[PDB]
Amino acid sequence: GGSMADKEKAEGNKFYKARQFDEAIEHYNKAWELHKDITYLNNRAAAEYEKGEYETAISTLNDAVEQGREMRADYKVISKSFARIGNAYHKLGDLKKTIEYYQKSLTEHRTADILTKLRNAEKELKKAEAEAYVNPEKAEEARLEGKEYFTKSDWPNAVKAYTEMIKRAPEDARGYSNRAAALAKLMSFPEAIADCNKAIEKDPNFVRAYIRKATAQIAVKEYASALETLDAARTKDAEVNNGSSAREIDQLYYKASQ
């Protein structure tokens, strides 16, 4: 039925809107029965999704695209199928397939949403994989590898080793200070400063990191800053270390005044 099945659909939409999902679903099926058009299936999938039956929704939709292809259905509507699969997978917390099905939807028909939803799901995946990468024992293994390359003056490999440590333990200030040490040896000073800064936000009480920052600042003739960094360094050294690296601070203080 032309106008006949469109009423069943419309009746579904009325029930769907009042959150009566099984009632919506049955009218969507009636619509399909009367007139083979995949819109009605996309709509049933919406009802299934809203019920929280995410597997049923994906099932309904996978079938919808297969039947839509056989029927040569409009590229937009099958793009919605793929898009809803993406949503359903995202509700299932399966980030791979949500991304895969967003790609599939954009391939069929590029829209603004879905492009935004893809970038958000990709963002969310990056964050997750990063949080999975974190490993205590792999971090300690990297810290040991770094010291080995550092003792053998292999700065480029030490940098890599210490980057693995930063990735394996993003909260350990030693990784940044250590990469900062190797970077300085390679005379990449602005980078050495930046790693020292992140080391100091990770551990405000980490003296060695203040000393590297200042040393690298002196090396790039940033004298005003070097003296400030050295003050901060001396304050935290009194508090934390009983001023046990004061002679080292002083030498750098003297060079930064000269």
Partner: peptide
């Protein structure tokens, strides 16, 4: 809610 057509 998801869009119905």
């Amino acid at each position: 809610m998801e869009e119905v057509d």
